[PDB]
Amino acid sequence: IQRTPKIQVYSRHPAENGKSNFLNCYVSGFHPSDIEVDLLKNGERIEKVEHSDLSFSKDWSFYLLYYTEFTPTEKDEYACRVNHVTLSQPKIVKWDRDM
Amino acid sequence: GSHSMRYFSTSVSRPGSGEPRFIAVGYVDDTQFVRFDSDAASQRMEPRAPWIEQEGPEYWDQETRNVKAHSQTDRENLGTLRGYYNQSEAGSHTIQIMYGCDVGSDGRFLRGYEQHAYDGKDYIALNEDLRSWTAADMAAQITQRKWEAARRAEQLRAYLEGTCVEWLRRYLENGKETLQRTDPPKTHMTHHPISDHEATLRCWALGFYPAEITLTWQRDGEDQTQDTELVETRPAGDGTFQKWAAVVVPSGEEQRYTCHVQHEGLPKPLTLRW
Amino acid sequence: AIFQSSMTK
């Protein structure tokens, strides 16, 4: 039995254009644990991305926090690209400053 | 002011490539403090919180010795379980384990746990009595019989009631400045027009610890769940947590709604209005 | 600190 990830894309701190922050991609609720997570800037993968140590919730489903330092601007568009065995194609979720 | 210590482990077999991958993490309440990864170069249990780094080399030698033995035993058990189920060697499978203890404000043992899963479903777990097991299927009943013959429950219970609560007490003392803190949520509301007719009011709670929190929406003072939406609580990456709740409202009726935020770090609940 | 023994299944 397999379970598809939920995906949230957000900053660590309230976003202020030109100030240093952290871009987060939280993937959770998935099984099995093998997962591909890329953070994108204007469509291209951010090379320096770290992630938390693999852990899991009470229902046995896994969660991971992927993150990278960034300085947001007005026009730079960020997103999180997720691929998992349960997904036909990679799923992209855009960073929305208001979610 | 209750507290927990929990250790999680995940072993995944990799039939294409070589050996299984084993990752263990330890937590005190919502704060992770150790990790071990069988693929990592160090081959040591590693610190993941500042207040654990004051432990000396005997401690790190001990945790490394024990967690390496847990890793090796999981390897063996993936093969054993695959044989129990007559499963193909071509498939990748997962063993997950969670165990730990809860204590109250006085440091006294409240309860202890050990749960095992195979491919993300219950396999076997120590029961509430700390004396017997619940096996999820015929394969786990083989394990249960072995653990009964070995009197595993008694050895595990001694850890859960003893060793586990002692180290937890020590960690809560050594990390008191961060473990016994409460960061209250920083709260605000945002407003996002959907159409001329409708708008979304979003209630934010940011930078709080512990992760437990309640966000409630009301209309004219009456609780409101219709047209609500709650996101899962999520880590900020800095050891604090975030959550928001939203409601879709008729344009021009925003003023009637209130959001309510309850958290351990707030003396009184907070009320927000647009 | 972790429990010292994990058991074969």
Residue numbers in the entry:
A (entry chain B): 1 to 99
B (entry chain A): 1 to 274
C (entry chain C): 1 to 9
Quote the study on this structure:
In this study, we determined the peptide presentation features of HLA-A*30:01 and HLA-A*30:03 through a series of structural and functional investigations. To explore the structural basis of the different peptide-binding characteristics of HLA-A*30:01 and HLA-A*30:03, we determined the structures of HLA-A*30:01/RT313, HLA-A*30:03/RT313, HLA-A*30:03/NP44, and HLA-A*30:03/MTB at 1.5, 2, 1.4, and 1.6 Å, respectively.
Here, we found that RT313 also formed stable complexes with both HLA-A*30:01 and HLA-A*30:03 through co-refolding assays. Although peptide RT313 was able to bind both HLA-A*30:01 and HLA-A*30:03, circular dichroism (CD) assays showed that HLA-A*30:01/RT313 (with a mean Tm of 45.4°C) was much more stable than HLA-A*30:03/RT313 (with a mean Tm of 37.3°C). The availability of the crystal structures of HLA-A*11:01, HLA-A*30:01, and HLA-A*30:03 with the similar A3-supertype-signature peptide, RT313, provided the opportunity to compare their cross-presentation features. Our crystallographic data showed that although the key residues at position 74, 77, 114, and 116 are different in the F pockets of HLA-A*11:01, HLA-A*30:01, and HLA-A*30:03, the binding modes of the PΩ-Lys residue of RT313 in the F pockets of these three molecules were quite similar. The NZ-atom of the PΩ-Lys residue had hydrogen bonds with Asp74, through a water molecule in HLA-A*11:01, HLA-A*30:01, and HLA-A*30:03. Although residue 77 of HLA-A*30:01 (Asp77) and HLA-A*30:03 (Asn77) were different, the NZ-atom of PΩ-Lys also formed direct hydrogen bonds with Asp77 in HLA-A*11:01 and HLA-A*30:01 and with Asn77 in HLA-A*30:03. Although residue 77 in HLA-A*30:03 was also Asn, its F pocket was able to bind amino acids belonging to both A1 and A3 supertypes. The strength of the negative charge of the HLA-A*30:03 F pocket was between that of the A3 supertype and A1 supertype alleles.
